[PDB]
């Protein structure tokens, strides 16, 4: 439904307004039951995650509990590890920039709460290098915490020993990928690996590893504190909890606000954030989960709401839940065209289908904006799109195909007219 | 992506970490597991850039030696990521975000403003080498859509004029109040908090027993 209470919200420091430093955090009481929780043991913590129903919170929303659980298997003499990706690259995502900058601590105890759940020896946080200032904030926060003894040996009074590190990203969206974050951490080129050697099995430095969206790590301590039920109650069925929503582009007050997941879309922009610029009638389309997810046109939108189950019914992905809105004042053919330009300037090129395919769609898309290309080419790009969708080594090729598929699926008449417009003036 | 040796950009340019920098390099190596120094390539290479913006081929070679990694590896990392200059770069090095979110909120205007403000075209640098204009991609901070990254700072939610003001500040004086130069605080609802209006909660609240 929606309308989460501020009291039941998780990052009270969102929008700042409270010292992102420890003191403000102590008034927040973020480090309240940390020793106790870890004392409970890895299993109990992971269990709470399952009860929570917390899905990914990052890109694909895999059940968090089960995922983390995959490394709750006995150590084989290799130190297990925690990797917390804070790349936050998906266009439209400033979701994570908040927790890191505004509430660094929540993530610090998220790390150790999560750490004992997987029995990780240590956690490395890969904040995108672009955010240099952001990094300045977290290690100040990390430094505070150890000074306190909250982390490190004798973590918060626990025999558990966990060390948290921050790693510099270098302006790559793909670094974000789970197998590629690792390789950047490993120091090689940021190129994803194949899934058959799964991340838990082969870890960073060949030591079991797990990767979580920073939001996913951050909520785990509060969910254990509030209990899985409290959390699981807010969401709809499988889709559960309240996910932060970042609305950017063609909305009166673009902002990131956390609301009950499964909140109706027509409502999200209506209640928080602000009204669609030019009236709700001025809504050509919206991309619910960021650039990777397909945009949904206005008639479908209010009907549907923001939860992953509802969106997959709608053929779109909740993803990072970044709402980008396009008024009737925008050349979508060019809007999506720059996202394909966003992906040609960024895919690693390791795999044949993404390398040439994304460049091929970029060339066709640029011609489509001009209208130089003939109408028959439009379904040609359909077929190029699915060749890339199922054949890619990672998901980015998955992601490049979806916006192209959305433009053809709902805005096929407009592209034909741009086709027609150029043919007429000759 | 080919380094054709040039008198300026080639190893004749000797590179070596200042004593202090080497100390920093050591810590960086400590974070990673022992026996995995190679993992510190990115961090160390960055430090080199901090030392010299150009990050010449010589620098890349030094990084390799310092981390005992094959020279090619350093090259791969440098030529793969984008935050590494691999050429001389402007003192200010402004970068304008032009992904759809920003563009939808009129990013193009900002770029145009800069082009003539700077007098230099994108992909190029000012004669004094004070400013280098680059059309970079999503830099995060999308909510404050109109946004650009001057050097390390993130100037956000900027209207065309604001930048001119900022650029002037950069041109005469320094530290031009880096950050979103609009009333909105960070990424709050511009008009008024849609939530988080009430005071934050307290320790232990609604906590399940133990």
């Amino acid at each position: 439904f929606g309308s989460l209470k501020d009291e039941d919200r998780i990052f009270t420091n969102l929008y700042g307004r409270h010292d992102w430093r420890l003191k403000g955090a102590l008034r927040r009481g973020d480090w309240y039951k940390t020793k106790e929780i870890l004392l409970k043991g890895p299993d109990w913590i992971l269990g709470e995650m399952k009860t929570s129903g917390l899905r990914g919170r990052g890109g694909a929303g895999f059940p968090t509990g089960l995922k983390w659980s995959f490394m709750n298997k006995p150590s084989d003499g290799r130190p297990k590890y925690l990797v917390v990706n804070a790349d936050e690259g998906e266009p439209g995502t400033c979701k994570d920039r908040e927790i890191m900058r505004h509430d660094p601590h929540k993530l610090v105890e998220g790390c150790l709460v999560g750490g004992r759940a997987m029995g990780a020896r240590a956690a490395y946080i890969y904040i995108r290098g672009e955010f240099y200032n952001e990094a300045s904030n977290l290690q100040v926060a990390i430094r505070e915490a150890y000074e306190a003894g909250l982390i490190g040996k004798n973590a918060c009074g626990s025999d558990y020993d966990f060390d948290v590190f921050v790693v510099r990203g270098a302006g790559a969206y793909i670094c974000g990928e789970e197998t590629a974050l690792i390789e950047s951490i490993e120091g090689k080129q940021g190129k994803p690996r194949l899934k058959p050697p799964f991340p838990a099995d082969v870890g960073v430095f060949g030591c079991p590893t797990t990767v979580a969206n920073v939001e996913t790590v951050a909520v785990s301590p509060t969910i254990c504190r509030r209990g899985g039920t409290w959390f699981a109650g807010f969401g709809r069925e499988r889709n559960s909890g309240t996910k932060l929503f970042n609305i950017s582009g063609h909305v009166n007050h673009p902002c990131t606000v956390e609301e009950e997941m499964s909140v109706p879309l027509k409502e999200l922009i209506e209640k928080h954030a602000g009204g669609v610029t030019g009236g709700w009638d001025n809504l050509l389309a919206v991309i619910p989960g960021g650039s990777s997810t397909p945009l949904i046109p206005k008639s479908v939108c209010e009907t549907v709401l923001m939860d992953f189950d509802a969106l997959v019914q709608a053929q779109t992905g909740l993803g990072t839940a970044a709402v980008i809105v396009m008024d009737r004042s925008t050349d979508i053919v060019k809007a999506i065209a720059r996202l394909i330009e966003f992906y040609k300037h960024e895919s690693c090129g390791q795999c044949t289908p993404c390398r040439e395919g994304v460049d091929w769609m970029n060339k066709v898309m640029a011609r489509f904006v001009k209208g130089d290309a003939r109408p028959a080419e439009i379904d040609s790009l359909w077929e190029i799109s699915k060749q890339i969708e199922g054949h890619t080594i990672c998901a980015l090729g998955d992601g490049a195909a979806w916006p192209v598929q959305g433009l053809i699926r709902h805005f096929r008449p407009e592209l034909e007219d741009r086709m027609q417009r150029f043919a007429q003036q000759h | 992506f080919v380094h054709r040796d040039t008198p300026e950009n080639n190893p004749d340019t000797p590179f070596d970490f200042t004593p202090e920098n080497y100390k920093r390099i050591e810590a960086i190596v400590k974070n990673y597991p022992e026996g995995h120094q190679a993992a510190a390539v990115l961090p160390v290479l960055d430090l080199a850039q901090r030392q010299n913006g150009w990050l010449p081929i010589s620098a890349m070679n030094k990084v390799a030696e310092v981390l005992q990694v094959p020279p090619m590896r350093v090259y791969e990392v440098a030529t793969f990521y984008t935050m590494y200059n691999r050429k001389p770069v402007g003192k200010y090095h402004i970068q304008v975000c032009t992904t759809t979110p920003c563009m939808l909120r009129d990013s193009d205007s900002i770029l145009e403003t800069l082009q003539r403000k700077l007098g230099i075209k994108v992909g190029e640098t000012t004669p004094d080498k004070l400013f280098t204009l680059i059309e970079v991609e999503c830099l995060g901070a999308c909510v404050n859509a109109p946004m650009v990254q001057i050097n390390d700072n993130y100037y956000e939610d900027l209207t065309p004029k604001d930048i001119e003001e900022i650029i002037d500040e950069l041109k005469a004086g320094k530290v031009p109040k880096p950050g979103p130069r609009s009333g909105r605080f960070c990424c709050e609802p511009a008009g008024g908090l849609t939530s988080l209006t009430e005071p934050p909660k307290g320790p232990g609240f609604g906590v399940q027993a133990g």
Partner: peptide, 22 residues
């Protein structure tokens, strides 16, 4: 306001806290 070495130098300061290596 932060310096170019804030991240690295701060980290070095944290080195002492950093738990022993693997």
């Amino acid at each position: 306001d932060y310096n170019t070495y804030t991240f690295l130098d701060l980290n070095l300061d944290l080195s002492k806290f950093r738990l022993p290596q693997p």
